[PDB]
Design a protein around this nucleic acid. Structure first.
Ligand SMILES: [Mg+2]
Ligand SMILES: [Mg+2]
Ligand SMILES: [Mg+2]
Ligand SMILES: [Mg+2]
Ligand SMILES: [Mg+2]
Ligand SMILES: [Mg+2]
Ligand SMILES: [Mg+2]
Ligand SMILES: [Mg+2]
Ligand SMILES: [Mg+2]
Ligand SMILES: [Mg+2]
Ligand SMILES: [Mg+2]
Ligand SMILES: [Mg+2]
Ligand SMILES: [Mg+2]
Ligand SMILES: [Mg+2]
Ligand SMILES: [Mg+2]
Ligand SMILES: [Mg+2]
Ligand SMILES: [Mg+2]
Ligand SMILES: [Zn+2]
Lengths: 80, 79, 129, 144, 148, 85
RNA sequence: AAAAUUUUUUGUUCUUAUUUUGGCUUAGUUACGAUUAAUAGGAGUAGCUUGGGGACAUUCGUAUUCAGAUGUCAGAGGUGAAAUUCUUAGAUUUUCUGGAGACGAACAACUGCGAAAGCAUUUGUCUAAAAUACUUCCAUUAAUCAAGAACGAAAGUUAAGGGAGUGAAGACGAUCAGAUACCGUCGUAAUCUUAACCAUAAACUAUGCCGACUAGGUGUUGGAUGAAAGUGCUUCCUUCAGUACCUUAUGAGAAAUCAAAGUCUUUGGGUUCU
RNA sequence: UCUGGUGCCAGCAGCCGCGGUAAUUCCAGCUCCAAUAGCGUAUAUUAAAAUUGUUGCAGUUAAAACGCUCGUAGUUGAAUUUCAAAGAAUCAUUCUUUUUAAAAUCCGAUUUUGUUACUUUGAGUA
RNA sequence: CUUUUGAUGUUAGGGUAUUGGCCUAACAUGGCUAUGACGGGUAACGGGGAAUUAGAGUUCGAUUCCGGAGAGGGAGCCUGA
């Protein structure tokens, strides 16, 4: 929804020693998206670190992979 | 003992409970008197079946095996 | 709903063994069950067994020798490192001289002594005394 | 099952269940509750000093029969008033109207002990000489 | 069952021999043409299978040809936009809703209608995850009656 | 946005008359100002013109009915009785 | 279709070609190209299949009470015993006629249906739900579920009806040392219907839900299969689903007891709540 | 189960308790016991506590199954796709060799054949 | 919850030893959250570590070394690498 800027979500599992089990966690990362890409909510992107470009952004997109989803983006769990 | 069950006992249980599940139904050749035509039929048929030559009823649906018309003769199909 | 076919098989075997039944039937089968049964066979805990072939998930019949004390699974298949075998075996097995703990390993299914001999870890499946 | 989740990714549920259920334990709730800094004359210490205000006698609980000797003390630290027991056969007449004493706990920290109803403190020193060395009476005499 | 308390086990069971019987005589083209003609008349796949079993001699379609009924009905561009069982569920729901419009004091009917709509939503989610239904297919409860 | 939590239509009365009288007015006037199906032409366009007269905005027929609604139950019961005979 | 090593013409450069390559249109050739059908789930078809499952409309019955007659004459009620109460202006009692509102005896069960709360006169319409039978269709579509939602006895609250019997309050008459009680004579709200609230019970099997295994017998409710007495129906034998009881447990418990409250220091099938 | 004194008083006692003439428990004398240049008391904290329970608790009657059903997030989910087979090294066991479908690649030939979790071994570290 | 008074981005500059809403003008409506945002409490400086424990765990760490912050409480400034 920004101009040449996107938000991506990373999912991962965290280990808890006392119970010998795992948990689901997540973090958000803002990135820069050049107009040579055509993205939308639900796809998969690969990003690389650069120098700070604003108060929050430090990455920008290098490759896009089309991916179809059926619920809402925040409710999907993909691990990589 | 368990590998080679008595065939009388096996054929005497529920179809889903025997070692190899097998149905209880079959197909058969039916002949009605004085029409001179042979027709395939399924035991436990759900529809009403009319003869090819004349529109004479050959069976009636029930809650189990179909009711075969009076005087008709049936013979199992070999396989 | 099943959620596991290994647990049901092992529970049925254990229940029949407690009564001295000399034969038992396992309804749902799979390759993992076959491998577990073969490993029990190799240690002389059971006799021979058949696989009955219907056109569904098959069935198994086994021969028992009045010789098993216990057989069960560990439901969550915890991931075990090579240097953590000692604690698990101390907690689970009845002695240091007999009994077996079964791991699944990147080199197949095997007990703990063979896992040490091969220098490998894995996850836990179950055990039999 | 047995009422707990046993999955490989069910650690949050177990952690939160244990976090909520600790508060039902009396010892835990006692040692983690913010008001213990307020409803406690010693405010966390083991001893305190005060000025004697009155001498009293207290009845024993029902099956027993006696008159136990105590003093009422006003604490220097915060001005509160407490009641303390004077141990010994005739140790009460070692104490005057307003002297300075040390008092400590009485063995069951938050609780009353034995036969005295509602006394949780005990005198250990008077006029900065030991009550025991003064009752032994073969050691020291009060600084008149 | 999924909602009530029943635990029945009644069902049909297939024979061990997967090949077609020796006494069967028709040609696969004839059976496919019968499928197409009998679906032209406005029947559903389950009705088609039942009629083939009874009024013709074909124990199983898959033994004679190589495909199932829905696949061959689709190979000709004849299949409906909405699957069979979902349509039956929708029809039951619209009937119950009409009756309930006529009677505001049925409390059992309200209960059963809630249960059927839950079924509808679950099956619709499954069919949308596959590409069998368009992604913006929603089932409004007020316009479903005109759906044919 | 939603401009009112409770009073809905009776917000024209302000704070007067008491809450329960406003509630009864609300119940009556919800029926009084609604639309009703015309059985003659099929459209839902029948509205009240006076205390007993109802009229369809499309076909322009006039039907005699109730005071605040188009039908009252007591007349429906008698009509059903006669029609059953 | 867009660039070429290799010679070409020029001192700024001009004059041309085999020369190394992605697709398109069509004919052609492949071993050309889709795992079962779960004693998982959902749909379907069949039976003069079952049921006090639900909603609306209809139909019947004695009893009770009111009013009208009807014949007779001194008590009737009620209690452990009596009062209060009705009555020669005819009580109570017997016969007939009309109205009113609730209720649905006997049959009726260690029997049926529903998620629970609950459901019982006849007939019609509407509406769902199992179970059984199946060589019908789809192919994992499922289990349990914070938040959220639908229902939810009796009492109680709001409005309009209805108002016989029963009867929290209240008034008397008795018993008693006292009796604001237990007993008796009256009797208001309520109890019933329509439209809205309230959301609680020893709302109990004081036993969450799904799946597997483990023991013998006697019944009973609803289907299907195979066989005998009948005067296309009854009995018997199997099998599926529901529902009780008895005996016994090198099974369990602190015990009472339990076919689950068993398969647990030989401790881990899945999941919610406390 | 020693002596003297006191007599529900004085007092002791973390807990159960002792104390009215016989007090093994108060106050003393004697004698014994424990640790010992050390030994008591108060407050806090760990084990004991499988009385916080992942390993590892209980929920008919002891504390504790929501009145009942639906339902999102969460947790958990049937079987199937290369299974084998034949020699060597050891006092049946443990090890170790040999190839059996395919396509691309050295004039009847070497070497490549999806991504994570998970597990093995390293690097780096006051 | 944040956003009139910079909250989240784009463009052009200013400034700094350099990147950056760090600041200024124009523009757009974004950013975080039941996987706990925004708030409250701490008798909370963080580690290397300590005590007690068969194995799990529970509780401490102002205080030898490393990192941070301050010189009664706040703000400003000169010299100088
Ligand atoms: Mg469910
Ligand atoms: Mg199936
Ligand atoms: Mg009346
Ligand atoms: Mg009355
Ligand atoms: Mg009365
Ligand atoms: Mg309650
Ligand atoms: Mg309860
Ligand atoms: Mg244990
Ligand atoms: Mg502790
Ligand atoms: Mg503990
Ligand atoms: Mg322990
Ligand atoms: Mg306990
Ligand atoms: Mg319950
Ligand atoms: Mg600005
Ligand atoms: Mg520190
Ligand atoms: Mg320092
Ligand atoms: Mg100072
Ligand atoms: Zn009209």
């Amino acid at each position: 929804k920004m101009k040449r800027t996107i938000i991506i979500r990373r999912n991962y599992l965290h280990y808890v020693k006392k119970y010998n089990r795992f948990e689901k966690r997540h973090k958000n990362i803002p990135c820069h998206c050049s107009p040579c890409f055509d993205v939308k909510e639900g796809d998969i992107v690969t990003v690389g670190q650069c120098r700070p470009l604003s108060k929050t952004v430090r990455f920008n997109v290098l490759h896009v992979e089309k991916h179809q989803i059926f619920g809402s983006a925040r409710k999907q769990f993909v691990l990589f | 003992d368990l590998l080679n069950p008595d065939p009388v006992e096996e054929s005497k249980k529920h179809k889903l409970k025997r070692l190899i599940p097998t149905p209880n139904s079959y197909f058969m050749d039916v002949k009605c008197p004085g029409c001179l035509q042979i027709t395939t039929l399924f035991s436990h048929a759900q529809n009403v079946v009319l003869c090819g030559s004349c529109n004479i009823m050959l069976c009636q649906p029930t809650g189990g095996k179909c009711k075969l018309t009076e005087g008709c003769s049936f013979r199992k199909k070999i396989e | 709903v099943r959620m596991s076919v290994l647990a049901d098989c092992l529970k049925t075997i254990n229940n029949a063994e407690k009564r001295g039944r000399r034969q038992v039937l396992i309804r749902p089968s799979s390759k993992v069950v076959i491998k577990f049964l073969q490993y029990m066979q190799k240690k002389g805990y059971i006799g021979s067994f058949e696989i009955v072939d219907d056109h569904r998930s098959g069935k198994i019949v086994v021969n028992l020798l009045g010789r098993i004390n216990k057989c069960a699974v560990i439901s969550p298949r915890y991931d075990v490192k090579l240097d953590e075998i000692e604690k698990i075996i101390t907690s689970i097995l009845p002695s240091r001289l007999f009994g077996h703990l079964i791991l699944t390993t990147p080199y197949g299914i095997m007990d703990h002594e063979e896992a040490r001999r091969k220098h490998t870890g894995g996850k836990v499946l179950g055990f039999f005394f | 099952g047995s009422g707990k989740p046993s999955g490989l990714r069910a650690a949050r549920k177990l952690r939160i269940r244990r976090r909520t259920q600790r508060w039902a334990d009396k010892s835990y709730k006692k040692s983690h509750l913010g008001t213990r800094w307020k409803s406690n004359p010693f405010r966390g210490s083991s001893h305190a000093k005060g000025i004697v205000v009155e001498k009293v006698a207290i009845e024993a609980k029902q099956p027993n029969s006696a008159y136990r000797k105590c003093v009422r003390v006003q604490l220097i630290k915060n001005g509160k008033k407490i009641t303390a027991f004077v141990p010994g056969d005739g140790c009460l007449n070692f104490i005057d109207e307003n002297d300075e004493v040390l008092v400590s706990g009485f063995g069951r920290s938050g609780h009353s002990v034995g036969d005295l109803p509602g006394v949780k403190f005990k005198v250990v020193k008077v006029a900065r000489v030991s009550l025991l060395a003064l009752f032994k009476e073969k050691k020291e005499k009060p600084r008149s | 069952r999924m909602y009530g308390k029943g635990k029945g086990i009644s069902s049909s069971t297939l024979p061990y021999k997967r090949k077609q019987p020796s006494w069967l005589k028709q040609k696969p083209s004839e059976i496919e043409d019968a499928i197409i003609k009998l679906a032209k008349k406005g029947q559903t796949p389950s009705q088609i299978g039942a009629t083939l079993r009874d009024n013709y001699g074909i124990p199983q379609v898959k033994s004679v040809t190589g495909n199932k009924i829905l696949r061959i009905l689709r190979a000709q561009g004849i299949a409906t936009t909405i699957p069979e069982d979902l349509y039956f569920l929708i029809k039951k729901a619209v009937s119950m809703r009409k009756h309930l419009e006529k009677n505001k004091k049925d409390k059992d009917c309200k209960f059963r209608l809630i249960l059927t709509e839950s079924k509808i939503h679950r099956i619709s989610r499954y069919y949308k995850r596959k590409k069998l239904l368009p992604s913006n297919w929603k089932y409004q409860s007020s316009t479903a009656s005109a759906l044919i | 946005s939603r401009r009112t939590k409770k009073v809905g239509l009776t917000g024209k009365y302000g704070t007067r008359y008491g809450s329960s009288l406003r509630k009864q007015i609300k119940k009556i006037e919800l029926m009084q100002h609604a639309k009703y199906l015309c059985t003659f032409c099929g459209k839902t366009a029948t509205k009240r013109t006076c205390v007993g007269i109802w009229k369809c905005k499309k076909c322009k027929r006039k039907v005699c009915g109730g005071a605040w609604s188009l039908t009252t139950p007591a007349a429906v019961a008698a009509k059903s009785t006669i029609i059953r005979l």
